């Protein structure tokens, strides 16, 4: 119950157009027993549909694969233009304007090394 | 009221200026006696700059075409825009011939048609009020254009000493000597007029033209009609701030004021990346503003010959990088971030250099709304190789004995030749001295 109304709350954060069941709202029984199955067809509906929205049009699989290639260096063919060119610029004592001159070198190297969609892969910022 | 008058002169100077007026009519959307598009007020917002406004529905050039050889203007008198210019107000019916593959031919036809060579521009000013200046569209190549053009660099600079004088000077082929043999003499006489009788100049090496003309066009034949195009396109590109909309940077005397640091350092290197028909297969990665000054700092668009170590043992002080055409240029500050880290353009170590980036739109027309243009106009002190190229081809021709008395019978009977060498070494030592 608690975790059905939770997820009907996370769809408001990706807008109301995927809240409200489209044929449930015809149920309301006076039996005891048989009202626990009402919970269950609630329970499978509102949890799957928040997954549909976010796999479809916010592209959660295309973001999770991309988190994978930066924090594990999966496609490292990018990193021989990324890492090499940041490590020269951090060799002197680190200041507050040194991580700025790295993230200038990152998005510099991003489009030379031409990953799939460079306007999608520009999300990264460098922190030191 | 910032009218520039072009002084097309010369057999090659009329021709490299021809395709400059033909480029301007196709973006102004005009016919040479009518209007056939609405691009005449919608693309062209400031319509008086080199044109004069309508009086019969047509914009009449502010062009004068005087040349010793009448062959070139008669190759303008028939063209489907040969009525774009006036048939008897922009060029005389014919002109007197010269000897005339020499500098003193054209220098002497300007001292007998002197009244008219200083009047054929006063009749072109008729919609102006205050004058911006004069552009001499002349070629150093041959004796015709080098000849009248060296005379007018002096007199329009002592009758209009606060106006722009600037020639789009273009050297002839220096790897052949029988193509113009008067080439080491007439260049250094002119090079004197560029450093103490000129405000700013554009000199473009010829072997660096034919470098792009067989690379970018992807052919193996440099013919002279693939060279009058590289020239006309960068000329018409620079005045895009004095025609199409833009705030900061809008004068032609604005651009050029930032690019002169000394009265003999003012020789501007030009690069212009687009000359290719592959900006439609290069849109698959998006046409963006995040590559349009990385291609204007990288040496593969250069139009001046210079060595490949004189580009780290000399320094740019001022480089103008004008990107053109809608592209989303509010990432233009993200772009300028990424230059300093590579240090792709060198900087002066005595103080700050300046990399000035500006933008301006272009007409609602097909090569200026899908095809982006980037003009780089540098001011680099690596230009001392060109003057060494000319001095090393000068003393060898004096070892060939040519023009020690075969030059001195078309009205020179005084020695004045080393005078051009000595002023030239004053230039070449001050170029290297100017950056610290």
Curated annotation (Swiss-Prot), chain B:
Classification via PANTHER family: TUBULIN
Binding site for GTP: 141-147
Subcellular compartments: Cytoplasm, Cytoskeleton, Microtubule organizing center, Centrosome; Cytoplasm, Cytoskeleton, Spindle
Gene3D superfamilies named in the record: Helix hairpin bin, Tubulin/FtsZ, C-terminal domain, Tubulin/FtsZ, GTPase domain
GO CC terms, sorted: centrosome; cytoplasm; gamma-tubulin complex; gamma-tubulin ring complex; mitotic spindle microtubule; nucleus; polar microtubule; spindle
Role noted for this protein: Tubulin is the major constituent of microtubules. The gamma chain is found at microtubule organizing centers (MTOC) such as the spindle poles or the centrosome, suggesting that it is involved in the minus-end nucleation of microtubule assembly.
Organism of derivation: Xenopus laevis
InterPro entries: Gamma_tubulin, Tub_FtsZ_C, Tubulin, Tubulin/FtsZ-like_C, Tubulin/FtsZ_2-layer-sand-dom, Tubulin/FtsZ_GTPase_sf, Tubulin_C, Tubulin_CS
GO-annotated molecular function: GTP binding; microtubule nucleator activity; tubulin binding
Main location: cytoplasm
Alphabetical keyword list: Cytoplasm, Cytoskeleton, GTP-binding, Microtubule, Nucleotide-binding
Key word Nucleotide-binding present: yes
BP GO terms, sorted: cytoplasmic microtubule organization; meiotic spindle organization; microtubule nucleation; mitotic cell cycle; mitotic sister chromatid segregation; mitotic spindle organization
Family per similarity comment: Belongs to the tubulin family.
Keyword Cytoplasm included in the entry's annotation: yes
Name recorded for this polypeptide: Tubulin gamma-1 chain
């Amino acid at each position: 119950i608690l975790s059905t109304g939770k997820y009907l709350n996370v769809v408001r954060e990706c807008g109301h157009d995927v809240t409200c069941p489209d044929a449930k709202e015809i149920t309301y029984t006076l039996k005891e027993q048989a009202y626990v199955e009402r919970i269950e067809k609630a329970y499978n509906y509102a949890s799957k549909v928040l997954l549909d929205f976010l796999m479809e049009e916010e592209e959660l699989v295309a973001h999770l694969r991309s988190i994978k290639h930066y924090f594990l260096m999966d496609q490292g063919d990018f990193f021989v233009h990324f890492m090499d060119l940041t490590e020269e610029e951090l060799k002197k004592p680190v200041d507050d304007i040194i991580p700025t001159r790295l993230e200038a070198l990152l998005e510099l190297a991003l489009r030379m090394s031409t990953a799939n969609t460079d306007p999608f892969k520009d999300d990264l910022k460098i922190e030191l | 009221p910032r009218e520039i008058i072009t002084l097309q002169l010369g057999q090659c100077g009329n021709q490299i200026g021809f395709e400059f007026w033909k480029q301007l009519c196709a973006e102004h959307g005009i016919s040479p006696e009518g209007i056939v598009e609405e691009f005449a007020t919608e693309g062209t917002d400031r319509k008086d700059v080199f044109f004069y406004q309508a009086d019969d529905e047509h914009y009449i050039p502010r062009a004068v075409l005087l040349d010793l050889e009448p062959r070139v203007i008669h190759s303008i008198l028939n063209s489907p825009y040969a009525n774009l210019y006036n048939p008897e107000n922009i060029y005389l019916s014919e002109h007197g011939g010269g000897a005339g593959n020499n500098w003193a031919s054209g220098f002497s036809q300007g001292e007998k048609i002197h009244e008219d060579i200083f009047d054929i521009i006063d009749r072109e000013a008729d919609g102006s009020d205050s004058l911006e200046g004069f552009v001499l569209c002349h070629s150093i190549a041959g004796g015709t254009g080098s000849g009248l053009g060296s005379y007018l660099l002096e007199r329009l600079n002592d009758r209009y000493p606060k106006k722009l004088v600037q020639t789009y000077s273009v050297f002839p082929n220096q790897d052949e000597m029988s193509h113009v043999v008067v080439q080491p003499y007439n260049s250094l006489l002119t090079l004197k007029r560029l450093t103490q009788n000129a405000d700013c100049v554009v000199v473009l090496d010829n072997t660096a033209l034919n470098r792009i003309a067989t690379d970018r066009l992807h052919i193996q034949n440099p013919s002279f009609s693939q060279i009058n195009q590289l020239v006309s396109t960068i000329m018409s590109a620079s005045t895009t701030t004095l025609r199409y909309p833009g705030y900061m940077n809008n004068d032609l005397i604005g651009l050029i004021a930032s690019l002169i640091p000394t009265p003999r350092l003012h020789f501007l290197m030009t690069g212009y990346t687009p000359l290719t028909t592959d900006q439609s297969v290069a849109s698959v990665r998006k046409t963006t503003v995040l590559d349009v000054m990385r291609r204007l700092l990288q040496p593969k668009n250069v139009m001046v010959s210079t060595g490949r170590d004189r580009q780290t043992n000399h320094c740019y002080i001022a480089i103008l990088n004008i990107i053109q055409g809608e592209v989303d240029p509010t990432q233009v500050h993200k772009s300028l971030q990424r230059i300093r880290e590579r240090k792709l353009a060198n900087f002066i170590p005595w103080g700050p250099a300046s990399i000035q980036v500006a933008l301006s739109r272009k007409s609602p027309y097909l090569p200026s709304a899908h095809r982006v243009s980037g003009l780089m106009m540098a001011n680099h002190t690596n230009i001392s190789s060109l003057f060494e190229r000319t001095c090393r081809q000068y003393d060898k021709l004096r070892k060939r004995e040519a023009f020690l008395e075969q030059f001195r019978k078309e009205d020179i009977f005084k020695d004045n030749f080393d005078e051009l060498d000595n002023s030239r070494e004053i230039v070449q030592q001050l170029i290297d001295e100017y950056h610290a």
